[PDB]
Swiss-Prot record, chain A:
Location within or outside the cell: Periplasm; Bacterial flagellum basal body
Quaternary context: The basal body constitutes a major portion of the flagellar organelle and consists of four rings (L,P,S, and M) mounted on a central rod.
Name of the encoding gene: flgI
Covered residues, full protein: 20 to 73 of 365
Protein species of origin: Salmonella typhimurium (strain LT2 / SGSC1412 / ATCC 700720)
Function comment: Assembles around the rod to form the L-ring and probably protects the motor/basal body from shearing forces during rotation.
Family stated for the protein in its record: Belongs to the FlgI family.
Lineage of origin: Bacteria, Pseudomonadati, Pseudomonadota, Gammaproteobacteria, Enterobacterales
Protein name (record): Flagellar P-ring protein
UniProtKB/Swiss-Prot annotation, chain B:
Subunit structure: The basal body constitutes a major portion of the flagellar organelle and consists of four rings (L,P,S, and M) mounted on a central rod.
Family that this chain belongs to: Belongs to the FlgH family.
Segment of the intact protein contained: 59 to 116 of 232
Protein name per UniProt: Flagellar L-ring protein
Subcellular location: Cell outer membrane; Bacterial flagellum basal body
Functional note: Assembles around the rod to form the L-ring and probably protects the motor/basal body from shearing forces during rotation.
Length: 54, 58
């Protein structure tokens, strides 16, 4: 059980994924949204997608 | 079904038939000008009002 600990197999590799999201349900410890316009912009985007146009 | 739609991404046109708003704001202004000049004035004179005798022949 040492070769598996010393080498890696060609083609058997890991990639990296990134994305943007919103986290809700905080107890008043979220963004101020006055210094972060993108939070409100993306919340409006989500609401518009769901059918609400602010 | 209209396919996958991102939730937080800004609404952009992605496929054929999608609409987009163009704000036409064009302001173009070009100009050019040039000139050239040249001048030349020349005056010359010589007169012998009173000629002494020894200079008369000349």
């Amino acid at each position: 059980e040492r070769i598996r600990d010393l080498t890696s197999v060609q083609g058997v590799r890991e990639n990296s994924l990134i994305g943007y999201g919103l986290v809700v349900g905080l107890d008043g410890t979220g963004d101020q949204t006055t210094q972060t316009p993108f939070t409100t912009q993306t919340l409006n985007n989500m609401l518009s997608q769901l059918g609400i146009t602010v | 079904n209209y396919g996958y739609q991102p939730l937080f991404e800004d609404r952009r046109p992605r496929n054929i038939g999608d609409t987009l708003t163009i704000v036409l704001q064009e302001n173009v202004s070009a100009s050019k000008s040039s000139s050239a000049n040249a001048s030349r004035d020349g005056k010359t004179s010589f007169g012998f009002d009173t000629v002494p005798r020894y200079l008369q022949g000349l």
